[PDB]
Structure 1
Amino acid sequence: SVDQKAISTIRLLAVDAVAAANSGHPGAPLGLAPAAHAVFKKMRFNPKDTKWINRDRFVLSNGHACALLYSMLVLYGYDLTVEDLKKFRQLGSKTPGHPENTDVPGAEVTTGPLGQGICNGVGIALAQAQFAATYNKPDFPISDSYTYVFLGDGCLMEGVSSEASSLAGHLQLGNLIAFWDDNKISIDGSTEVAFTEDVIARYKSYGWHIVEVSDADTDITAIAAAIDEAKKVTNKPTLVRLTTTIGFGSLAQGTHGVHGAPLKADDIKQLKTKWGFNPEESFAVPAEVTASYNEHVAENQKIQQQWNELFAAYKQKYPELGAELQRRLDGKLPENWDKALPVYTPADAAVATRKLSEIVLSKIIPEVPEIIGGSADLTPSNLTKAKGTVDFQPAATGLGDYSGRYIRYGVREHAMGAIMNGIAAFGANYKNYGGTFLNFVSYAAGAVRLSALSEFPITWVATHDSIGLGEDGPTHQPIETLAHFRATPNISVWRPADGNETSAAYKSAIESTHTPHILALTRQNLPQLEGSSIEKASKGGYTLVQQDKADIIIVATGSEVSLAVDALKVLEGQGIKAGVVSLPDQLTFDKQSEEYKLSVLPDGVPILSVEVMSTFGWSKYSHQQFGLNRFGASGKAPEIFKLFEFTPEGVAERAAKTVAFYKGKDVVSPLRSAF
C-alpha cells in the first residue's frame, strides 16, 4: 500500500543518511518509522509556516534518532531537502547529529541529552493549556492543539523525566500524548541488565492514561487508534507503549549493535529488496509517497486558513483580547511596559534583592500577560508569587485554574528548567521564570545549558546567592555556580546590587528573545546605591563612583558593590583614591562597544575585583581578584563575611597591596589582549 511504501521510504532515508555520514543511529529510526508515519498523519502542521500557533507539536526526546525526524520533515516539504539529508552529520549542515531548534526547520526544541525532550513536551503542553484558558471563548477554539513526544528507555531512566511525568500527571495535561519506544535495548545491551522496573505501573502511579500497542513494528491502525483513545481522555496525559524491534528489518535487528553505528552495506541491500526498493539506489523518494504526504499538507493548510479567519472573527468579537493575542504573535511586548519597573533613590531603605524581585514581579505581572512562572517548592523563600494571582492547576483540583499564572513545580529543579524551555518553545511571546536557591540551579544544569544552546528567553530567579544566606551552611552556599554559568555561551548572569539594578535585570530578562537569564539574588538586605539607575545598569557594567585620579578601581557585583563603596572610604583614610565599577551582568557588558567598555575599565590603573565566590572569569575585567575559592560555613552571615575578610578593611587591605604591587609598572586595561 502507499502507507507501507511511505514507512519503507522513511526507514530507508534514515539508513541512507547514516550510511552517507558513516556516523549516527539507524536502530530507533527503523523501529519508530511506523509510529512516526501514523503520528504525523494525525498532526496538524504547515511545513510552510512552522510558527502557526495552533499547530500540533512533535518532540523527539530520543534525539539520537534524528535521522527519523529529518526524514519526516523532508518528506513533508519543510525547508529541508534530500540534499540536506545527504549532508547528515557534516560540518555546517542543516542536519546535525542531534536536532537543534536554531538550525533545523520543524525542530521545536534541541534534544539529544536524554530525558530533556519529554520534559520540554510537558512545558509545551502546559503552555498550550494556559494559552487556551487565557484566550479561548465560546465558538472560538483559538488553541486546541496536542503535544506528541517520542521517547526511549534512556529518557525513562533519566530522573528528569520522572520529575516532569509526576508533575504532568498532577496537572492533568490531557493534550500530552507520549510514545515509549519499548524495544528492550540500550547501549549496554538488554534492558534486563539495568532497567527492569514496571514502567507502565509507574506511569499509572503518576496519574497517566496508558495504551499498549503490542505490534508497533507493523500495526499503524492500532497506533492511530491509540491516538484517538488518548484524545478522549481529557484529564490525563497518555503514555502509548510501542513494542518495537530496534533496527526492524536489519540483519542486526534486536541487538545493541544496531543502536548507534551505520549498518553494513549488504544489510542495506537486503532491506531495500525486502521492501521493494532498488538496492543500487540511495535516498529514494517514491512520488506516490510525496503525493500522499502532500494531500495531508494541503488539508492542514486549509485548516490553518480557516484558523486565520477564526482569529480575524475573534478580533472583532473580543477586541481587547484579540489585540493582545496579535501583539504576542508578533513577538512584541506591551508598549511602554517598562514604565511599571520600580525605581529607587539612595534615600530609600535597604532591601534584599529577593524582595526587590518580588516587588518587580508584583508590578510587571499585571502589565505583561505573557509572564508566567513558578518555584521549585521555594515560593515563600524565593518570593516568586505576586499577591492576587492564581496558581496554574486543573480546576478539578480546586487549587487553581489553567488560566493561572503561578506554577507549583515541587522539588523538581531539573524538570522545572526543561519545562521552562518547553514553555518558551510554545511561543506566543511567553516570558517564563522559575525560582530556586542559586546553589540548586546546578541540579538543572542539563536543561540550563540547553536553554543557552536553544536560544530560549527563560529566567531563573535564583535567590540565596552566597554565604550571605548564613546558617544553612556550605551545602547551600554557591562558590562555583556563577563561574559555571558565565563560562557557558549565551547565558546572561545578573547579580544586581540594589533596587535599580534589579529592575534593569528584569528589563533584560523580559525583553530577551534569544538569551536565557539567571538572576542571582540575596537573602540579606542591601542599601540603595548612590549612582545606580536602570539606564546605567542596563549596560551590564558601569562606573558607579568615578574618580579621575584613581589609584585603583574596584569592580564588584551584587552584595559586594556596597562593600566596595565602604572600602573606598577606608582607603581615603589611607591616602588611596578608588573608583567603583558595578558589573551586574558580564554578558551584557561584553556586548557593549569597545569604547564604552574601556570607559568603565580604562588603561593606566590597577583594577581589583570583589565577589564572594569563585575568582574564575574575573581576570577578564581585573588585574587582581578577591574572591572565595573554598566552601562556606554554617553561621550567622555577618560572621562568615568577617571570617573570610569580606569587610571594608579586608577589601581595603587588598586594594592597598594591589596599588603597591603595580608601583613602577605600566598597567593596561584587562580588556586588552594579544588576539
Structure 2
Amino acid sequence: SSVDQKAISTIRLLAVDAVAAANSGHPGAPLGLAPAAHAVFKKMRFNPKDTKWINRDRFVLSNGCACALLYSMLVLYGYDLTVEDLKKFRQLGSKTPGHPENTDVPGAEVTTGPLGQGICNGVGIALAQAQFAATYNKPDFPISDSYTYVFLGDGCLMEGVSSEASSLAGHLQLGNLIAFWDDNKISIDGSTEVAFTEDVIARYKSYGWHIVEVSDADTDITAIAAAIDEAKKVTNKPTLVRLTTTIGFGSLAQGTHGVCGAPLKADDIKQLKTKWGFNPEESFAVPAEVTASYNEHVAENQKIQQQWNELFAAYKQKYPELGAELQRRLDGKLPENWDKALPVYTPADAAVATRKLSEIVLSKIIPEVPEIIGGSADLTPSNLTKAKGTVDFQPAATGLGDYSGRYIRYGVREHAMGAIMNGIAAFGANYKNYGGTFLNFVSYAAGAVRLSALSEFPITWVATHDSIGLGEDGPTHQPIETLAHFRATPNISVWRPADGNETSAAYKSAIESTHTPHILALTRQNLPQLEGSSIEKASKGGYTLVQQDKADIIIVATGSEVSLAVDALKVLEGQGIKAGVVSLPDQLTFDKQSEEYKLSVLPDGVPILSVEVMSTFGWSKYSHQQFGLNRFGASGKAPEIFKLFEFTPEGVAERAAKTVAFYKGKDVVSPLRSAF
C-alpha cells in the first residue's frame, strides 16, 4: 500500500541518514532489508513501552552491522530511542552504537555484530521459549506462544557457529524460529561467487529446516508476510526464508560491495530521496502517517499484552503453584532460601573431584530452582552435568525427551552452545543456564563467551578437566592460557574451586548472578576437603584459608593448587619458614570486595607467592612472585606431570624459600597497592 511504501522509504532513509551523520557505518543491508523489516515487525507482537513482556515475539539482527535498520525500526515504533539518538549514531556515549548492544539499546535483545552470533542467539531464545511454554502452558492458558525472528546475512551463514546452531535447531524441531537470509550475493570481498557457492537451501533442508523462497524481497512484502504465515504452519521445523534482495537497493551503487560498509555519497542520498518522494534537503524525516500506522500496530500489541496480563492472573487463580513460580521468575527472584540446598563439606569428608562435586551441586539445586537448565557439548559423562532423573530437552516426537526437559544435548558444538546459552539468558524469565565442556575447549566458543560478558548475561560454563591434572589426554587438552584469557576479559567470573565448599560457593555465585557470566574451572582428579573452607568465605572470591600471624610468606593458590600450597606449608615448617595460605577461587569476585577486605587477605609487609598450574598472567595483581606453567603440558599420568614441572610440596616450598630470600631486607607492600 501507499503507507507501506512510505514506511519502507522512511526506514531506508533514516538508516542512510544515520550513516551519513556519523560518516561511518553500513547502509547497504539496511536498504536491502527495510521491506522485510517492515513486514516482519508488522507481524510481531511487542510493546515498545514494556521491552520485557515475556510473551513478546523476539527479533534478532544477526547481521549486526545493519543496525541502522534496527535502530530505525525501534525509533519508528516508539521504543525509548529517538530520532535525536539516531542522529548520534556511532557517537561516543550514544544509545545508537555501531553494533547493537543489549545493555545500551532498548529493544536490542542481544549484542550482535560478530557474525554468526545472532542466529545462534535466536536458536537459544527459541529453545527457551519452547521449554518455558512446555513448563507453564496449560489448556486454555497459552502463557507462552511467541516466535523468534532472525535476520542474517551471507557472513553469518559462512561462520561455523551458525552451522552448529542450525543443525541443532533442526534436530530440535524448533518451529517457532523463523530466520530470514538476506540473499544479496555480495559480501565485503565482493561477489559471493568468490568464496560462497554452496547450495545454502539444500544445506538447510539437510538440517531439517523448512524453506520459503521470496524471489523479489526488494518489493514483495506480501510474499514476505505470506512466508511468515507459512512458517507458522510448520510447527515442527525452524524455517529459513530466502530473501532475494539487492544490497543497497535504490542507491546508485546498489548491488556492489562498496555499498556494504561505507557512507553513501551525498548526491546518491539526494536521488534516493527524490525518487521515493522525500525532500533531498531534509535528513531524518519521519512522515507522521508512518508513525501513525506503526502506532496502530503498537496499540493492538498493547491490547494483546493487556489480555495476556489477565490470562496470567487467571492462570494464577487456577494453577496457584505454577503461577507463583512464574511470577517469582518474572520478578527476577530465585526461590527463597534456595541456597540451603547447596552441599556443605567438612575436612572429614572424602576427597572428590570438583567435576563430581559440581554434579552433586546440580543434583541438589536443579530440583529446587526450576529456571536452571543446561547441557554439555557431547561430554555429559565426563563433565558430569546431568542430574539423574531429569529428562532431556527434545521434541517429544523423537521419543528422546520433551520440551519440558531440562538437559540439552548440544553435541560437539561448543561455540553454538555458548551463543545459545546467551539466547536462553536473553529470553529472560530468570533462566540460569549452563553448558559443559572441557576448559580447553571453552576456547572454541570465545566469540560467544566474550559476548556473554559484554551483554551481561548470567550464563555458566561447567568447564572440567581444567589442567595438566587431567593427565593422559595431553597438551592438546590441557589449558595453559585459558584462565588468563577469560580473566583478562571484563566481566567474567572465573571460579576455580578447590574443594566441596568452594564448589558450592561457585554455584551460589553463578546462579545468583544477574549480570556476570561464570566459568567454573573444575578438575578431573580428586581433591581433598580443606580445613578452613566454607561457602561463606569462598563467596568472597578470595580468603585466608590458613592464617599465619608472623608469616614469612603467603602462598596464594586456586583450585587443585590450594591443597598443594597447604602441603608446601608443612614442608616449609620443617625448613623454619612460616607460611600462610590464601585461596582465590574467583579473582573477579575478590576484586569487587572492599579494599580493606582485600588487604586483610593480601596484607602489606609479607612476600606473596602465587601457585596455579597454568599461565602466570594476571597473577601479579595478587602476588610478588608467581609459580605457574607457561609452556604446554604433556601426555602422562597426572601425578608424574606435576612432578616433572615441580608442582610438588617440595617444589613449591623451594620457590617459597627463594622468594623469602629474594625479599630479605627489602620493604614489601601488598600487590594490591598501585600508583594510580
Asked if these proteins are the same fold (TM beyond 0.5), I'd say yes
- By how many angstroms is 1:292 displaced? 0.3
| 1:12 alignment counterpart | 13
- By how many angstroms is 1:620 displaced? 0.2
- By how many angstroms is 1:225 displaced? 0.2
Give 3-state SS (helix, strand or coil) of 1:529's partner: coil
Q: What is the rounded CA distance, in whole Å, between the counterparts of 1:344 and 1:274 in structure 2?
A: 74
- By how many angstroms is 1:562 displaced? 0.3
Q: What is the rounded CA distance, in whole Å, between the counterparts of 2:674 and 2:371 in structure 1?
A: 42
Q: What is the rounded CA distance, in whole Å, between the counterparts of 1:212 and 1:129 in structure 2?
A: 26
Q: Any idea what the Cα deviations from partners look like across 1:290-309, whole Å, max 9, x if unmatched?
A: 11000000000000000000
- By how many angstroms is 1:161 displaced? 0.1
TM-score (norm 1): 1.00
Q: What is the rounded CA distance, in whole Å, between the counterparts of 2:105 and 2:126 in structure 1?
A: 21
| 1:81 alignment counterpart | 82
- By how many angstroms is 1:69 displaced? 0.2
Give 3-state SS (helix, strand or coil) of 2:393's partner: coil
- By how many angstroms is 1:31 displaced? 0.2
Give 3-state SS (helix, strand or coil) of 1:604's partner: coil
Q: What is the rounded CA distance, in whole Å, between the counterparts of 2:344 and 2:326 in structure 1?
A: 29
- By how many angstroms is 1:657 displaced? 0.3
- By how many angstroms is 1:604 displaced? 0.3
- By how many angstroms is 1:211 displaced? 0.1
Q: What is the rounded CA distance, in whole Å, between the counterparts of 1:62 and 1:177 in structure 2?
A: 15
Q: What is the rounded CA distance, in whole Å, between the counterparts of 1:111 and 1:78 in structure 2?
A: 19
Q: What is the rounded CA distance, in whole Å, between the counterparts of 1:573 and 1:278 in structure 2?
A: 87
Mapped pair 1:543 → 2:549: no
- By how many angstroms is 1:446 displaced? 0.1
- By how many angstroms is 1:413 displaced? 0.1
**Equivalent residues in 2 for 1:608-627 (5 A)?**
608-627=609-628
- By how many angstroms is 1:579 displaced? 0.3
Mapped pair 1:408 → 2:409: yes
- By how many angstroms is 1:10 displaced? 0.3
- By how many angstroms is 1:377 displaced? 0.2
Q: What is the rounded CA distance, in whole Å, between the counterparts of 2:350 and 2:292 in structure 1?
A: 70
- By how many angstroms is 1:131 displaced? 0.1
Q: What is the rounded CA distance, in whole Å, between the counterparts of 1:284 and 1:637 in structure 2?
A: 67
- By how many angstroms is 1:347 displaced? 0.3
Give 3-state SS (helix, strand or coil) of 2:652's partner: helix
Q: What is the rounded CA distance, in whole Å, between the counterparts of 2:278 and 2:600 in structure 1?
A: 68
Q: Any idea what the Cα deviations from partners look like across 1:336-360, whole Å, max 9, x if unmatched?
A: 0000000000000000000000000
| 2:239 alignment counterpart | 238
Q: What is the rounded CA distance, in whole Å, between the counterparts of 2:188 and 2:403 in structure 1?
A: 40
Q: What is the rounded CA distance, in whole Å, between the counterparts of 1:175 and 1:376 in structure 2?
A: 23
| 2:327 alignment counterpart | 326
- By how many angstroms is 1:592 displaced? 0.2
**Equivalent residues in 2 for 1:409-558 (5 A)?**
409-558=410-559
**Equivalent residues in 2 for 1:201-600 (5 A)?**
201-600=202-601
Q: What is the rounded CA distance, in whole Å, between the counterparts of 1:444 and 1:146 in structure 2?
A: 26
Cα RMSD, aligned residues only: 0.2
Give 3-state SS (helix, strand or coil) of 2:226's partner: helix
- By how many angstroms is 1:276 displaced? 0.4
Q: What is the rounded CA distance, in whole Å, between the counterparts of 1:514 and 1:115 in structure 2?
A: 23
Q: Any idea what the Cα deviations from partners look like across 1:582-631, whole Å, max 9, x if unmatched?
A: 00000000000000000000000000000000000000000000000000
Q: Any idea what the Cα deviations from partners look like across 1:352-377, whole Å, max 9, x if unmatched?
A: 00000000000000000000000000
Q: Any idea what the Cα deviations from partners look like across 1:516-570, whole Å, max 9, x if unmatched?
A: 0000000000000000000000000000000001000000000000000000000
Mapped pair 1:60 → 2:61: yes
Q: Any idea what the Cα deviations from partners look like across 1:183-235, whole Å, max 9, x if unmatched?
A: 00000000000000000000000000000000000000000000000000000
- By how many angstroms is 1:48 displaced? 0.1
Q: Any idea what the Cα deviations from partners look like across 1:444-474, whole Å, max 9, x if unmatched?
A: 0000000000000000000000000000000
TM-score (norm 2): 1.00
Give 3-state SS (helix, strand or coil) of 1:555's partner: strand
- By how many angstroms is 1:257 displaced? 0.3
5+ residue gaps, structure 2: none
Give 3-state SS (helix, strand or coil) of 1:609's partner: strand
- By how many angstroms is 1:151 displaced? 0.1
Question: Aligned pair count?
Answer: 675
Q: What is the rounded CA distance, in whole Å, between the counterparts of 2:406 and 2:427 in structure 1?
A: 16
Q: Any idea what the Cα deviations from partners look like across 1:271-295, whole Å, max 9, x if unmatched?
A: 0000000111000000100110000
- By how many angstroms is 1:125 displaced? 0.1
- By how many angstroms is 1:117 displaced? 0.1
Q: What is the rounded CA distance, in whole Å, between the counterparts of 2:17 and 2:522 in structure 1?
A: 51
Give 3-state SS (helix, strand or coil) of 1:608's partner: strand
Give 3-state SS (helix, strand or coil) of 2:250's partner: coil
Q: What is the rounded CA distance, in whole Å, between the counterparts of 1:75 and 1:567 in structure 2?
A: 65
Give 3-state SS (helix, strand or coil) of 1:38's partner: helix
- By how many angstroms is 1:481 displaced? 0.1
- By how many angstroms is 1:636 displaced? 0.3
Q: What is the rounded CA distance, in whole Å, between the counterparts of 2:551 and 2:71 in structure 1?
A: 59
- By how many angstroms is 1:155 displaced? 0.1
Give 3-state SS (helix, strand or coil) of 2:437's partner: strand
Q: Percent identity?
A: 100
Give 3-state SS (helix, strand or coil) of 1:508's partner: helix
- By how many angstroms is 1:478 displaced? 0.2
Give 3-state SS (helix, strand or coil) of 2:580's partner: strand
Give 3-state SS (helix, strand or coil) of 1:539's partner: coil
- By how many angstroms is 1:33 displaced? 0.2
Q: What is the rounded CA distance, in whole Å, between the counterparts of 1:644 and 1:453 in structure 2?
A: 36
Q: What is the rounded CA distance, in whole Å, between the counterparts of 2:344 and 2:329 in structure 1?
A: 26
Q: What is the rounded CA distance, in whole Å, between the counterparts of 1:276 and 1:575 in structure 2?
A: 89
Q: Any idea what the Cα deviations from partners look like across 1:108-136, whole Å, max 9, x if unmatched?
A: 00000000000000000000000000000
- By how many angstroms is 1:254 displaced? 0.2
